[PDB]
Design a binder for these strands. Structure first.
Ligand SMILES: [Mg+2]
Ligand SMILES: [Mg+2]
Ligand SMILES: [Zn+2]
Lengths: 483, 41, 95, 115, 69
RNA sequence: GGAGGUCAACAUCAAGAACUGUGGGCCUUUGCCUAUAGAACUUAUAACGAACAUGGUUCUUGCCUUUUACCAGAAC
RNA sequence: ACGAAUCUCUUUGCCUUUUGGCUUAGAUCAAGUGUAGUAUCUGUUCUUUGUAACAACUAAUGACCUCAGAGGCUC
RNA sequence: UUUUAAGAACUAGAUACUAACACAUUUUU
RNA sequence: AUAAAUUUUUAAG
RNA sequence: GUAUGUAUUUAUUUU
């Protein structure tokens, strides 16, 4: 040290001072090597003369093509010699691949949570939201070109199922709110409160939020008026404002957050509240769809265990008897929903006005910074009433799983619906292999009580279409590692 | 560093330490002028 | 805090108050006029107070001819000149 | 020489109160300490319009500017300050006042406010 | 006034300066010796590979299909 | 000529369980085989030091806004 | 009659003072605060023997002389 | 020419400068 | 019939 | 993380 301090004190510090690449200045160098590497090529393709003007110009075209690649915009230049476009496409493809790979690498470095800088979390978040929206727009376009996947036949089968159910229940399509409604004021008060409670605890209110609170106050002062405006929107307006997405990070998952505009938020809230009130009032949802009101989730689990035990014979080892539980995530669900179908299946349950409304509300331009695309296919889970839609559709799936009969057994007769766990006779229990079925949002939990006959039949057909000589079905088989 | 530097300085009246000072002095003077009005009656 | 604070602190001043008594420091880049002339002291001192005027005569004298266009401004600055030059006269007269 | 510094070497004698007296005498003769004026970096809350070059200080702009303790005292006792700001385009000084009774500023001499 | 660069510094310049003689950390002698070579079912409703690209590959859609939840 | 020196210079001190010289035979000097002489200092619960520090690079961690300074293991 | 040269104008060509970077669009568009660091001043009072008489003493300029600026004399 | 500041003594007590740094603020009545 | 013991501070931004 | 910048000529260079 002191050697350097003193020799530097007489002789002055070295004039060269080259400086190595490290974590902070890396990206700068990468840019620099790239723009140089494109300078060489696009100078060597051109036949002779021009340099500096066309230098600056062509490198600008580089930058623009990159930005437009982040934004998913295809970047066509109205004219430009094709070979140059070959080159720039090449290099920006390169940079793209390196960039993505850095996004993966940093992410799986954060999931372990070892020494990631304060910013790299933010930056990586940004790259992931960009990439995620790119996957989305890809999926939607390829759905246009490839057409919808439902096919007319399967759709007809589905709709038939739902109709058969809604007659089996003798269900009344929910009436659209009357201009005079006895409970209407009571519901409105809650919906405004539920919007208010977001802002009760906030400190600093941005402009949009202040505008909202203005709409809430003016909404209290004129409940009759704001009803008039709300229902008027339910009728007239089929076209809506764009919606912003800001992905919030859980440090492992990155989850989306939809943000809608206040006027639309009010009608969405009122319509939501209405649908849930009338729906639970007419007992649309059977017992076994339960992320429901009366029970907090641990109480749900407890009742699910007590439900398991209390019903008969399951612990009998007497001869061959066995039992099975399925825990199955439905997988992508809101992302595969289609509107041509939604409009109809909502026509069954609800007046065509609200159904058409909801159907249209999901097609809206989605905007994140540069990236923007119409949402042509899947569900937007951020709408206030996306709850009701989501559950209803879930029911539509469950009727497929259980079949009409057994479902009527669980939900029991429309005269006297059962409770969460009940039946009429233990016969009705034993009359079917499925004993307990409940669906908590995505998750599906199923209970089967088998005997040697039926079980050996099932494995006879399964093995009959799946020969497994090496007995290796149990390799890819997964089970709990916590115990 | 984003918002207004004015909030971080003392002289500006809009921030809550000085606004409170004005509240207190004005309140005291309201008491005094009130009592002195009642005396003259 | 701007060094205006840091140069006026006690720990800065006290060494100046020692340098006056122990030697020939104390500047004259600090103090102002002093307002009255005849109240000044031995010649070797007013000598430095006088240059402490002529320097400003040079600065603002250069600041006269500048095109920078503010005529009211150069009017008041012109009067300031005359004032100072009169002071220069006074310091010479005392000498 | 650390930015956060606990001690400062003092001369071996240094009667501190004596230095307070002699320094208190010294405080009158200096040019800077007595300037009656002040310099502060600040912002423009209410925006502006210049009355010379009609330049616009758009909303809130940093300035190196000048604070002055005003001879007024709001009510019986409250301090009230007057700030000055030079225009970027032209050499012009615009002033403020801070009304403690009405929280917002009121201004004079060389600028007008946008509505 | 930020600019791309439109050039590099030719080491020829640094070749004509005089050496300072500061001693660095990594130039202390190390590795100093070379090395030389020598009935229930009947009621149901329904009866009964390398792409070159980063975004459209399969691993990628696995990735974003997971970490976005 | 003997005893010494808080004197110096030049050699040598980590390896086929290992050093050097020499005689003789074969290949064609090297190298292999055979014969002979001398081997200070350091080594088997392994080493010149019956002791015990720091630095560089590369990985793994630990603190955890970032860099020096760091946390404790490994290889070179 | 065409060859040759100057001046003026129009069209084509060249294009002349003709967007010079990267990162999470670099971030944000606020009746709002926290937190960290550095430094000491304003008022009042006080201060800035006479007459008469007698005796003695009180720098600049010019001219002249002497010596190698100094000395003396006069106005 | 013009002009008045400087010294001595006494009193009670808190105020300026900087913002580069962090700003889901959440939440139990 | 148990004897099982981590840390610890300065500068710059 | 308490910027930064500009100027601070006194002693008289041969016509
Ligand atoms: Mg940095
Ligand atoms: Mg900095
Ligand atoms: Zn102006």
């Amino acid at each position: 040290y002191i050697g350097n301090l003193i020799t530097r004190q007489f002789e002055g510090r070295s004039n060269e001072i080259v400086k190595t690449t490290t974590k902070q200045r890396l990206d700068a160098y990468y840019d620099l090597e790239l723009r140089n590497s494109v300078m060489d090529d696009i100078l060597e393709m051109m036949p002779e003369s021009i340099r500096q003007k066309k230098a600056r110009t062509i490198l600008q075209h580089l930058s623009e093509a990159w930005r437009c690649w982040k934004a998913n915009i295809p970047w066509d230049v109205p004219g430009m010699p094709a070979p140059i476009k070959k080159i720039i496409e090449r290099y920006i493809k390169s940079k793209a691949d390196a960039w993505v790979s850095a996004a993966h690498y940093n992410r799986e470095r954060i999931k372990r949570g070892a020494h990631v800088e304060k910013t790299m979390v933010k930056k990586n978040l940004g790259r992931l939201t960009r990439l995620w929206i790119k996957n989305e727009q890809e999926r939607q376009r390829q759905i246009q070109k490839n057409g919808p996947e439902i096919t007319p036949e399967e759709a007809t089968t589905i709709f038939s199922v739902m109709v058969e159910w809604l007659e089996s229940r003798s269900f009344s399509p929910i009436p659209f709110p009357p201009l005079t409604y006895k409970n209407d004021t009571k519901i409105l008060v809650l919906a405004l409160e539920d919007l208010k409670d977001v802002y009760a605890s906030k400190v600093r209110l941005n402009a949009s939020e202040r505008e909202e609170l203005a709409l809430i106050e003016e909404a209290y002062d004129n409940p009759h008026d704001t009803l008039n405006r709300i229902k008027k929107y339910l009728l007239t307006q089929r076209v809506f404002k764009p919606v912003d997405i800001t992905m919030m990070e859980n440090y492992q998952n990155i989850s989306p957050v939809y943000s809608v505009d206040p006027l639309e938020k009010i009608t969405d809230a009122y319509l939501d509240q209405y649908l849930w009130y009338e729906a639970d009032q007419r007992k649309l949802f059977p017992n076994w769809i339960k992320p429901s009101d009366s029970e907090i989730p641990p109480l749900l689990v407890y009742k699910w265990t007590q439900g398991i035990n209390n019903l008969s014979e399951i612990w009998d080892v007497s001869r061959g008897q066995s039992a099975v539980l399925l825990e199955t995530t439905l997988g992508e669900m809101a992302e595969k929903i289609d509107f041509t179908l939604l409009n109809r299946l909502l026509r069954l349950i609800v007046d065509p006005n609200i159904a058409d409304y909801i159907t249209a509300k999901n097609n809206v331009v989605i905007n994140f910074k540069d990236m923007s695309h119409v949402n042509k296919y899947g569900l937007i889970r951020g709408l206030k009433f996306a709850s009701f839609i989501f559950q209803y559709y879930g029911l539509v799936i469950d009727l497929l799983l259980l079949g009409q009969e057994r479902a009527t057994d669980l939900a029991g007769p429309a005269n006297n619906p059962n409770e969460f766990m009940q039946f009429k006779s233990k016969e009705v229990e034993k009359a079917h292999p499925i004993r307990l079925y409940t669906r908590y949002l995505d998750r599906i939990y199923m209970l089967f009580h088998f005997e040697e006959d039926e079980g050996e039949e099932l494995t006879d057909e399964y093995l009959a279409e799946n020969p497994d000589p090496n007995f290796e079905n149990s390799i890819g088989y997964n089970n709990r590692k916590c115990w | 560093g984003s918002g207004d530097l004015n909030l971080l300085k003392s002289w500006n009246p809009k921030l809550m330490k000085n606004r409170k000072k004005v509240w207190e002095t004005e309140q005291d003077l309201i008491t005094e002028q009130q009592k002195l009005n009642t005396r003259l009656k | 805090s701007r060094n205006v604070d840091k140069a006026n602190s006690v720990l800065v001043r006290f060494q100046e108050q020692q340098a006056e008594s122990a030697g020939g420091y104390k500047d004259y880049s600090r103090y102002q006029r002093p307002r009255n002339v005849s109240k000044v002291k031995s010649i070797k001192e007013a000598n430095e107070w006088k240059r402490q005027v002529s320097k400003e005569i040079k600065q603002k004298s250069t600041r006269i001819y500048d095109p920078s266009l503010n005529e009211m401004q150069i009017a008041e600055l012109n009067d300031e000149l005359n004032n100072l030059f009169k002071e220069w006269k006074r310091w010479q007269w005392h000498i | 020489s650390e930015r956060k510094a606990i001690n400062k070497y003092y001369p071996p004698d240094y009667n501190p109160l004596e230095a307070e007296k002699l320094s208190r005498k010294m405080a009158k003769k200096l040019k800077t300490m007595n300037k009656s004026h002040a310099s502060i970096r600040l912002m423009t809350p209410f925006s502006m319009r210049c009355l010379e070059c009609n330049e616009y200080i758009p909303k809130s702009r940093k300035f190196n500017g000048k604070k002055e303790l005003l001879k007024e005292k709001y009510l019986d006792s409250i301090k009230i300050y007057r700030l000055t700001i030079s225009c970027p385009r032209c050499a012009n000084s615009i002033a403020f006042r801070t009304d403690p009774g009405n929280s917002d500023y009121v201004m004079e001499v060389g600028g007008v406010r946008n509505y | 006034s930020h600019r791309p660069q439109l050039e590099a510094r030719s080491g020829a310049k640094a070749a004509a300066y005089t050496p300072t003689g500061i001693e660095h950390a990594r130039l202390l002698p190390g590795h100093t010796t070379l090395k030389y070579r020598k009935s229930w079912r009947k009621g149901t409703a329904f009866g009964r590979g390398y792409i070159n690209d980063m975004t459209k590959s399969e691993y990628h859609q696995e990735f974003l299909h997971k970490h976005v939840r």
